Write a protein that binds this ligand. Structure first.
Ligand SMILES: Cc1ncc(COP(=O)(O)O)c(/C=N/NC(=O)[C@@H]([NH3+])Cc2c[nH]c3ccccc23)c1O
Ligand SMILES: Cc1ncc(COP(=O)(O)O)c(/C=N/NC(=O)[C@@H]([NH3+])Cc2c[nH]c3ccccc23)c1O
Ligand SMILES: [Mg+2]
Ligand SMILES: [Mg+2]
Lengths: 422, 420
């Protein structure tokens, strides 16, 4: 056991944090001691306080923390079978989860490859695309194309398709310009012309549909995805959708691809898949992709993580997916978006604010200058909210269980850090 | 809910398995329905059968399945806090685990970066090495060197240091390290490293045991040589202990057989006792401080589920359970049982070698082992074995009794007998 003071001492000496230093941290981490529902208990000045998890712990906690149905699914599975190797063995949690994911994802995605993290699932999707074209006798189709503004994880291949300026740029991939928010057919015509020149060396287009999360919380018209589907079909390039942040209702559709009625050839999901309990991700592909890989000289997808298809993670994901589908989740997200829109409207008039935008249960204030976390974090904590701004963005992706009142507290805190920026 | 028959139906239609095809698998998976201690319950011909998990579920289940101390650590943490983002927050399970890992790993490893899988932890170690030399103003030091026979995961950078014969970055490979110590091999490794030193960020190897690449063992004195070569030529040394850690080779970490400390080390697999995916990359203070003072100012990596409290809490319990008992005597007794039980295999006509290292036992055969013959032969004897290439091997849970070890080795000998 450790007191909060001892936690901070160990942390400062021995723990790396995301995109951080050791011993140069201008702001040291805050100790979290409990989480329940939409609330985190954090230690502030040696006193525990409850604050709203406005970020859903980086998009994961869609049902909140410690939801009784998800806890019970985990403890039920734990009593039976914690984990067995997926080499030569299968089990009921993987089968239940695979069946669910195939039924609820865009039509045509009928096979499921489980992995342990989103970045790995993106690498599996790339491996699938590359082995597909090798199986078609076109091994020159080796590169990936994307548009700027994206984020796909931190492994070396995933990094090669992240926005180059938001990754300090590895494989040299093809980047189209930033897709705009409002639909401009000239953008799609130019994307096509750029892809056409590279078609013979391109295995896939990879994009985040409708919402680009970690790269800038930018939204784009779903009609762009119909254009990509059509360009990819006409030029013999696969289409991969990275729905690791957008899946499971977040943008108001079950998957963002559903806003456009398009099906990619390959899709990645993660994050909210387990309700934020455990790391799990999945890469889905069409029957054609699967059969082409399996019929190639290679004969098999050469990927297999040790903890593939972990029964505990699958069991809680089954419960999390069923809990979502068993409720009127579509109405719940619409009400969340309306609450975010009403709460963030005051921000439109603030002098440091450039844009306010909402899409499903995602709210964003974009500012004209970086927001200083040394100012933003205490301002938000004083208002009972945990917010984590980055670059010039103050944003929220709240749990689906937040009441109207909790949304008022979250948006009030966002507007106030925006007011403090100017 | 699904019966076993329905599980097999869904599985065959919708689930990819490791290193497999869809619809072309000559062998379909067996349904597992329970696991307790060293035993799995599998469905065979519609009936449940108990079999020993001789593989510890791919090296992870060192305390067996459903151990009460690990079950309870997980449920205790579940009642408090499932998960919080590690960006701007810290918590007691991560701190308790980092404190443990720093104290039990080779000396000088003082900082801990948690990730969700072994493959990712290997890429973090490569990122640490590359950012280290950039922080020293030597960004030409960009490549990795290893010896043949290795395996480090399936992500694209990890694949680049896998044995090429068993789109990728072009790394530097020394020949297969032999089992017996030969100073000529170390001299040749040194001569090859010397030619590339100005472009090498790190040497990366699995110490003492190379697992997935062939279950090959090598004399620990080679690691003393690598440490000295790396120190003299200013190349970082990275040990991948994802399979060898936590007592498996008879020492707590295989590097301890040599008394060597690398600059960077990866651990995983048995870290959680086989409950949950977790991995960690450790580095010295000097590596950490050089990266933090570099133009970057930070290690540019950070997975969503970094330092997951549930995974950390169960790992803390697994490590403390291992340290709280006389694990060294346990592993010596397990190794003695494997040696005694596998001795009969040496004289079999298809067997090329029998070798044991700690709680690892290997029969190397003169032909690839046919899983369609080996798997029922092993199940008929109450043992789950998963051969690969020409190897029949076991890495059993540390809780196996002498009789269970004898049952495992008797089953291994019998599949080896069937190969010829
Ligand atoms: C030292 C080290 N470094 C990194 C990693 C990656 O770690 P991760 O999987 O991403 O968590 C590992 C993972 N080893 N995994 C296995 O041995 C199993 N797949 C069994 C396995 C080994 N040969 C095989 C051949 C065919 C089928 C299964 C297997 C590691 O041993
Ligand atoms: C669509 C999609 N695809 C793949 C992955 C990889 O997923 P994984 O992390 O390997 O499981 C994710 C992960 N998003 N992660 C987060 O939002 C933050 N933790 C990262 C994060 C927080 N500040 C940052 C500043 C700069 C860059 C990244 C970050 C994803 O959104
Ligand atoms: Mg379908
Ligand atoms: Mg490898």
């Amino acid at each position: 056991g450790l007191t909060p003071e001892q936690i901070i001492a160990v942390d400062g000496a021995h723990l790396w944090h995301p995109y951080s230093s050791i011993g140069r941290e201008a702001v040291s981490p805050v100790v979290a001691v409990a989480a329940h529902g939409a609330w985190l208990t954090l230690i502030r000045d040696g006193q525990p306080i409850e604050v709203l998890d406005a970020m859903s712990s980086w998009w994961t906690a869609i049902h909140g923390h410690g939801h009784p149905a998800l806890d019970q699914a985990l403890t039920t599975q734990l009593r039976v079978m914690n984990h067995v190797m997926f080499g030569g063995l299968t089990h009921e949690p993987a089968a239940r989860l695979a069946k669910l994911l195939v039924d609820i994802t865009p039509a045509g995605l009928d096979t499921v490859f489980f992995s342990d993290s989103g970045s790995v699932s993106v690498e599996v999707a790339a491996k699938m695309a590359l082995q597909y074209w090798r199986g078609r006798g076109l091994p020159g189709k080796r590169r990936l194309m994307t548009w700027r503004g994206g984020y796909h994880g931190d492994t070396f291949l995933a990094m090669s398709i992240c926005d180059p300026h938001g990754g300090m740029h590895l494989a040299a991939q093809v980047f189209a310009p930033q897709v705009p928010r409002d639909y401009d057919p000239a953008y799609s015509a130019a994307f096509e012309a750029q892809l056409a020149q590279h078609a013979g060396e391109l295995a896939a287009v990879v994009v985040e549909p409708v919402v680009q999360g970690a790269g800038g919380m930018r939204f784009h018209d779903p009609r762009y995805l119909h254009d990509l589907r059509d360009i990819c079909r006409r030029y013999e390039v696969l289409l991969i959708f990275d729905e690791i942040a957008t899946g499971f209702g977040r943008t108001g559709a079950l998957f963002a691809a559903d806003h456009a009625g398009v099906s990619p050839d390959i899709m990645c999901v993660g994050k909210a898949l387990t309700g934020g309990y455990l790391s799990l991700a999945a890469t889905l592909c069409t029957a054609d992709v699967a059969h082409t890989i399996s019929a190639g000289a290679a004969g098999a997808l050469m990927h297999g993580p040790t903890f593939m298809a972990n029964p505990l993670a699958c069991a809680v994901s089954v419960a999390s997916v069923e809990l979502l589908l068993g409720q009127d989740w579509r109405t719940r997200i619409t009400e969340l978006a309306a609450g975010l829109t009403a709460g963030l409207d005051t921000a439109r008039a603030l002098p440091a604010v450039t844009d306010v935008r909402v899409c499903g249960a995602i709210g964003v204030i974009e500012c004209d200058r970086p927001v200083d976390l040394a100012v933003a974090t205490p301002a938000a904590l004083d208002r009972g909210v945990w917010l984590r701004p980055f670059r010039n963005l103050v944003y929220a992706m709240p749990p689906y269980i937040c009441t109207p009142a909790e949304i008022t507290q979250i948006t009030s805190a966002m507007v106030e850090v925006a007011r403090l920026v100017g």
